Structure formats: structure tokens, C-alpha cells
């Protein structure tokens, strides 16, 4: 184990599966990349210059975000058909810098220019250590309030546990960190999972 670190909670599915960003220069780099990419791919000519002739699962592409209409780097996790629109397949896309996942029409996808792969993927998957469900939807919502997900609230993270993740045969297993989150101020810290426990949402 090492010293605690500064993180942003960027995306949340459950306390057992959420995504964090490391607080530092790569955040600003990320803002730059978002601005730039949006600028570029907002022009039709550029979309045509990088139109996808073929799309595969796991392939990294440029993709719009339905909520804010901006362009992001995203990995295609799955593809499923529209029963009522043969001209439109949809892809379950994973936004690599934030962590959230959305269904996006394949038509809306564009090839991701190579130089845009330069910056490390910012979203790190984590779960909350020391707590199990008693998940309930309002527990998840509460967690999103506490963490202030995607609202750029800096929080302190300490790794406590982990869970291995399979790879190829004989390849080094990955490790998904079980961390604790804190909102530190002068009055003290706020242990998110301990709040979840106290409010009866989670169990020690």
C-alpha cells in the first residue's frame, strides 16, 4: 500500500463499480483534448475524412456524448441491432476518460485520429472497500451525491484492498483497487463508505 492520492469521481454505476480520474496536469490536458476533438469532429469535412467504413468490438473511436453533444474517445464494448431500423445498429460505447457507458448509433461514430491516442486514458475503474450492499438504487444515488460525481469535486483516495482480473493464459492478472473515499477539510474528513454504512445502505 502507498500514500493517499487526489481523485475526481468521474463516473458511477455502483459503489462496486465506479470510475476515477487522477488529479493533476492530465486533467487540463484532458480538457484541451476534449475542446480540440469537439472542434475538429464538429466539422462535416473532418467527419467525412475519418468516416468509419468498418467497426469492431474493442475498437477505439471518436464518439459524441448524448448529454452535452461533445466528442470523446470511446471503446466499442458491444453491438446490437434495431428491430425497427435496419439502417441503424447501436453500439454500447465506453468513454475511456470518464468511465460512463452509453448506447450510440453506429452512424454517429467516426475514426479516432492516431495523434489523439497520445494521452493516457484517464478513467480508472475502482470499487469501494470494506462495504457490502444491504446494491439498492438510492444507495447508488446517495453515493453519487457524496462523491459529487462528474462535478469535479476533489476527494482523497486510499487503496485498502483489490480484486484480480483475468487476462490471457499466463499473462499477468490486472488489479482493480478497492479504495476508500474522503472529503477532507479543516473540520475533518468524510468517509463515504462509513456514511453509506451508517445510513443503513451498506454493511461493514
> Residue 111: beta bridge partners?
61
φ/ψ of 64, rounded to 5, equals: -75, 155
* Cell triple for 154: 476533489
* Cell triple for 152: 469535479
CA dist., res. 51 & res. 33, Å (int): 20
Q: Quick one: three-class SS letters along 10-79?
A: EEEEECCEEEEEECCHHHHHHHHHHHHHHHHHHCHHHHHHCECCCCCCCCEEEEECCCCCCEEEEEEEEE
Cβ atoms of 173 and 165 within 8 Å: the answer is: yes
CATH number of 1-35+116-204: 2.40.50.90
Q: What is the CA radius of gyration of the chain?
A: 19
Q: How was this structure determined?
A: X-ray
In 3D space, the residue among 78, 39, 42, 62 whose CA is nearest the CA of residue 114 turns out to be 62
In 3D space, the residue among 116, 190, 202 whose CA is nearest the CA of residue 153 turns out to be 190
> Residue 7: beta bridge partners?
22, 155
In 3D space, the residue among 4, 24, 6 whose CA is nearest the CA of residue 153 turns out to be 6
For the chain, what are the domain ranges? 1-35+116-204, 36-115
CATH topology of domain 36-115: SH3 type barrels. (2.30.30)
Long-range own/partner contacts, residues 133-141 (CB < 8 A, 24 or more apart): 133/15, 133/16, 133/201, 133/202, 133/203, 134/200, 134/201, 134/202, 134/203, 135/14, 135/15, 135/16, 136/201, 138/201, 139/15, 139/196, 139/201, 139/202, 140/12, 140/13, 140/14, 140/15
- Helix, strand, coil percentages for the chain (3-state, nearest 5): 25, 40, 40
CA dist., res. 176 & res. 96, Å (int): 16
* Cell triple for 126: 475502482
CA dist., res. 47 & res. 43, Å (int): 7
Question: Counting beta carbons within 10 angstroms of the beta carbon of residue 5, is it exposed (0 to 12), middle (13 to 18) or buried (19 or more)?
Answer: middle
Amino acid at each position: 500500500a502507498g500514500p493517499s492520492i487526489e481523485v475526481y469521481v468521474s463516473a458511477v454505476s455502483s459503489p462496486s463499480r465506479f470510475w476515477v480520474q487522477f488529479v493533476g496536469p492530465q486533467v487540463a490536458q484532458l480538457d484541451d483534448l476534449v475542446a480540440h476533438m469537439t472542434e475538429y469532429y464538429s466539422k462535416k469535412e473532418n467527419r467525412e475524412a475519418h468516416t468509419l467504413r468498418h467497426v469492431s468490438v474493442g475498437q477505439v473511436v471518436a464518439a459524441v456524448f448524448r448529454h452535452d453533444g461533445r466528442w470523446y474517445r470511446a471503446r466499442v464494448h458491444d453491438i446490437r441491432p434495431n428491430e425497427f431500423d435496419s439502417s441503424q445498429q447501436v453500439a454500447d460505447v465506453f468513454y475511456l476518460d470518464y468511465g460512463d457507458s452509453e448506447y450510440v448509433a453506429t452512424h454517429e461514430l467516426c475514426e479516432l485520429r492516431a495523434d489523439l491516442l497520445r494521452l493516457r486514458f484517464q478513467a480508472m475503474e475502482c470499487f469501494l472497500a470494506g462495504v457490502r450492499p444491504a446494491w439498492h438504487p438510492q444507495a447508488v444515488e446517495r453515493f453519487e451525491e457524496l462523491t459529487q460525481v462528474a462535478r469535479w469535486k476533489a476527494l482523497v483516495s486510499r487503496t485498502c484492498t483489490y480484486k484480480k482480473t483475468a487476462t490471457a493464459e499466463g499473462e499477468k492478472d490486472k488489479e482493480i483497487p478497492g479504495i476508500k473515499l474522503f472529503d477532507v477539510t479543516d473540520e475533518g474528513e468524510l468517509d463515504v463508505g462509513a456514511v453509506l454504512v451508517a445510513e443503513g445502505w451498506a454493511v461493514a
